[PDB]
């Protein structure tokens, strides 16, 4: 394949005994281990759930450490086209990674949920709607939808979506939540929001709590 | 998959009896049937060879007919990022299409050759070097190598390459041949050229003749 394999991590539900799957998608400069930590507070409430977190296919070239799903031109000093390419390629890799994990867990699409952060959220909102089969749901923390104009045309699947954003975010503007949110609604997605009041570019306890509820319902 | 399946055509060697595979990659505005025509003069000299030609995953939006491997911003009035994305996505689709055809023919990579035209040539020079296993070879007619700077880093496989370009080409400058050619050589590819003297953006008899020789040797 031209496909790139993603290294990853896993918990907590025992290998072979998972009844649902959630995949964490980390942000620019981080790695899977970062978000996979979220498994600690979530697992007791999602007993049958397996949690997986891949590292993005490329090292963060500007950061100097950690990984990126694609470079960020204005921050990275990379070309916008090289960035757009990384994004499309990274989506295919992630698409494949998903199929692989669902196999090893022996689960079907509707038992899978995506939980992203930043750049991870952008990857989730891009890949899921373009998969053949509708997944359980998506939780996107702060939070941007690439190319909202192409959503209606390219949406094969329309899983429920919960957007969670901090109203003091200096990195990704809080206004983006409404942008993503309106476009998902108009494209026919069942769309929910949660506002982390006072919160910047980060995941607050209240946001995490609402995500958990959303996940416990949508998940088997 | 997010993967897109490509409709295609085939000849001439009998289904199940192919000993080698060549895939034609058409240009912006055309379709597979266009280049697949080349099978008529080539088949008698490549008796065991099967010829296949996919249609590019998208309709040519600006043309109005035929297909594109990706839009061409300055000609298409599409964004450069949307174009770069189409390119990376189209490469993954083509990557997959290849694996599929090699299966149905029951052949291995080293028995596959790519023959491109224009945009098709750009797709070939991008995908082949990024496949795990080295193919028989590539013939690229006029002819541009995307992102030559990334070749050395991203070249997993280095099949032989023959570049064929017309020295009167108003569409893709003849200078591009040397650009692609030097970069392939420096990246360690075995690289050949053929100049279609007097020829514009098109495939001349002499170019086709040299391609045939190249193919008869490299192919099983
Ligand atoms: O483990 C350390 C704790 O803090 C992390 O916070 C960091 C997160 O590790 C990082 O990915 C982000 O940094 C963002 C900085 C990168 C920006 C976005 C991309 C462009 C460059 C700026 O900040 C959040 C703030 O909670 C996690 O969100 C939180 O779960 C974790 O428990
Ligand atoms: O079947 C018609 C004959 O002519 C075609 O020629 C056309 C080809 O069908 C087309 O793809 C290209 O047009 C290029 C025009 C498109 C340009 C490049 C992309 C940007 C837009 C301008 O011209 C060549 C000239 O031989 C084929 O090359 C030749 O094999 C075929 O037998
Ligand atoms: O894990 S830690 O808590 O140490 C911080 C995690 N991390 C910090 C650095 N960035 C981007 C750097 S840059 O985009 O500003 O160059 C990725 C996220
Ligand atoms: O098959 S035919 O012999 O009829 C011509 C094949 N064909 C002509 C049109 N172009 C691009 C049109 S545009 O890019 O200039 O809009 C695709 C190639
Ligand atoms: Cl909203
Ligand atoms: Cl040369
Ligand atoms: Na971003
Ligand atoms: Na071109």
Determine if residue B63 is left, alpha or beta; phi over 0 gives left, psi from -120 to 50 gives alpha, anything else beta: alpha
Distance CA A48, CA A113 (A): 13
**Distance of CA A29 to CAs A56, A122, A213, B52, Å?**
9, 15, 28, 43
Number of Cβ within 10 Å of residue B47's Cβ equals 11
In sequence order, the β-bridge partners of residue A37 are none
C-alpha distance from residue B207 to each of A73, B37, B203, B204, B219 (Å): 41, 16, 6, 5, 18
Query: Phi/psi zone of residue B143: left (φ > 0), alpha (ψ -120 to 50 degrees), beta?
Result: left
CB A19 within 8 A of CB A111: yes
Q: Is the peptide bond before A52 cis (omega within 30 degrees of 0)?
A: no
* Rounded-to-integer distance, Cα A169 and Cα A189, Å: 25
Q: Enumerate long-range contacts of B181-186, CB under 8 Å, 24 or more apart.
A: B183/B145, B183/B148, B183/B151, B184/B125, B184/B145, B184/B151, B186/B152
Å resolution of this model? 2.3
Rounded to the nearest angstrom, the distance between the alpha carbon of B28 and the centre of ligand 8 is 8
Query: Is the CB of B178 inside 8 Å of chain A's CB atoms?
Result: no
Q: How far is B90 from chain A (nearest CA, A)?
A: 9
Q: Which of residues 76-95 of A touch B (CB under 8 A)?
A: 80-89, 91-92, 95
Taken as a whole, chain A contains a residue count of 220
* Domains observed in chain B: 1-220 (3.40.50.1820)
Q: Looking at the DSSP assignment, which residues form a beta bridge with residue A51?
A: A11, A22
Rounded Cα distance, A76 and A80, in Å: 10
Residue B84 sits at the vertex; the CA angle it makes with B83 and B87, to the nearest 5 degrees, is 90
| Three-class SS state of B175 | helix
Alpha-carbon A58 to chain mean position: 17
**List of chain A residues whose C-beta atoms are within 8 Å of the C-beta of residue B84:** 80-85, 88
Q: What angle do CA B180, B186, B189 make, to 5 degrees?
A: 75
CB–CB contact B85 A85 (8 Å): yes
Which residues is B13 bridged to in the sheet?
none
Q: Is the peptide bond before A81 cis (omega within 30 degrees of 0)?
A: no
C-beta atoms of A1 and B127 within 8 A = no
3-state SS class at B76: helix
Q: Given B84, B92, B130, which is nearest A92 (Cβ)?
A: B92
Coil vs helix vs strand at A160: coil
d(CA A47, CA A37): 16
Strands in B49-54's sheet, in edge-to-edge order, are: B8-12, B49-54, B20-25, B112-117, B137-141, B161-166, B191-196
Looking only at the bridges linking them, the beta strands covering B58-59 and B67-68 are antiparallel
> Ligand 4, residues B28, B69, B171: which to mutate, most atoms within 8 A of Cβ?
B28
The alpha carbon of residue B28 and the mean position of all alpha carbons in its chain are separated, in whole angstroms, by 12
- Kind and range of the H or E element at B127? helix B119-127
Could you say which ligand is closest to the alpha carbon of residue B161?
6
Q: Are B111 and B136 in contact (CB under 8 A)?
A: yes
Could you tell me how many residues make up chain B?
A: 220
Ligand 4: distance of its center to the CA of B29 in Å?
Answer: 5
């Amino acid at each position: 394949i031209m496909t790139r394999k993603l290294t990853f991590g896993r918990r907590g539900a025992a290998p072979g005994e998972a009844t649902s799957l959630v995949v964490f998608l980390h942000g620019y400069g981080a790695d899977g281990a970062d978000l996979l930590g979220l498994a600690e507070p979530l697992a007791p409430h999602l007993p049958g759930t397996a949690f997986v977190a891949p590292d993005a296919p490329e090292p963060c070239r500007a950061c100097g450490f950690g990984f990126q799903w694609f470079p960020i031109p204005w921050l990275d000093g990379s070309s916008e086209t090289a960035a757009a390419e990384g994004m499309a390629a990274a989506a295919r890799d992630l698409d494949a990674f998903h199929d692989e994990r669902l196999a090893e867990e022996g689960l079907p699409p509707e038992a899978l949920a995506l939980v992203g952060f930043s750049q991870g959220t952008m990857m989730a909102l891009h890949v899921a709607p373009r998969r053949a089969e509708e997944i359980a749901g998506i939780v996107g923390f702060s939070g941007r939808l690439l190319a909202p104009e192409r959503l209606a045309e390219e949406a094969r699947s329309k899983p429920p979506v919960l957007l969670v954003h901090g109203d003091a975010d200096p990195v990704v503007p809080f206004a983006d939540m409404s942008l993503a949110g309106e476009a998902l609604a108009e494209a026919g997605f069942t769309t929910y929001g949660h506002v982390m009041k006072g919160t910047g570019h980060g995941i607050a306890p209240d946001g995490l709590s609402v995500a958990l509820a959303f996940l416990k319902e949508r998940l088997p």
